[PDB]
Design a protein around this ligand. Sequence first.
Ligand SMILES: *C(=O)[C@@H]([C@@H]1NC(C(=O)O)=C(S[C@@H]2CN[C@H](C(=O)Nc3cccc(C(=O)O)c3)C2)[C@@H]1C)[C@@H](C)O
Length: 265
Amino acid sequence: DLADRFAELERRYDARLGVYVPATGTTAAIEYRADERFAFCSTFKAPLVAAVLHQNPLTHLDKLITYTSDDIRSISPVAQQHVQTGMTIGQLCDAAIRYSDGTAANLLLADLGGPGGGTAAFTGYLRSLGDTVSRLDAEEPELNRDPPGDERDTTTPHAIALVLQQLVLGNALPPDKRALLTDWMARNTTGAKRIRAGFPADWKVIDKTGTGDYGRANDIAVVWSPTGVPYVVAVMSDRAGGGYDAEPREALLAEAATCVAGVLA
Ligand SMILES: *C(=O)[C@@H]([C@@H]1NC(C(=O)O)=C(S[C@@H]2CN[C@H](C(=O)Nc3cccc(C(=O)O)c3)C2)[C@@H]1C)[C@@H](C)O
């Protein structure tokens, strides 16, 4: 039984696990703690890129953004190298999704603009997609640090799955912008040990991970079966029992995804 298996994983990893897969044509929704809040961590970067894409002409991707030493405040594998040159909006989107670059995310939030350095406009974008649950309150690095249970900077597996479904499978974005987002998620470098690890090789997986304090490890994905049937998979986890420095456990997400894949096969 799936709920029993997910509970077993919680005990194995001393973790809290949330899973949602929306209903499709012939499969019921899969849900485990799906309406409980979990920190976004870096998973917000996927809808952030969608918001920036939606807000601007496509060739806004070519606008050069400059930034300085004091902008590097979080894990930023790409932006750390480009303080002198700057990065275009398209380079920032690429880095935010594929390398989970925190500075890139902060600069994209500032591009979106408005109160809270763009966090309010990001939340507004989610509201426009019918998500009345999620909220972004801080930027990097603070957004990963809220204590367990705090509602700041949270989504739920259910809410983020429905947002991702609209972005990738629905009509939230026009086809050209949709393809940009999908391709960046398809080319993600950070997700091999999470949802990808749970699905057979002949299933396509595109994803955005998140990792944070209190042992937080998330992954949001769209998967496609070998015959082109898509499913959205959101897995979120934390480990409050280990305190602030608890190790995130990718293995928990790989096991949870393996269980989901067995149901979807
Ligand atoms: C956003 O959440 C966050 C950055 N994003 C991600 C992410 O996974 O998307 C990370 S983590 C980074 C990429 N994958 C590696 C990883 O998962 N390492 C890992 C996994 C499990 C345990 C450990 C450990 O205990 O050391 C390490 C590393 C990155 C933090 C920022 C922008 O806030």
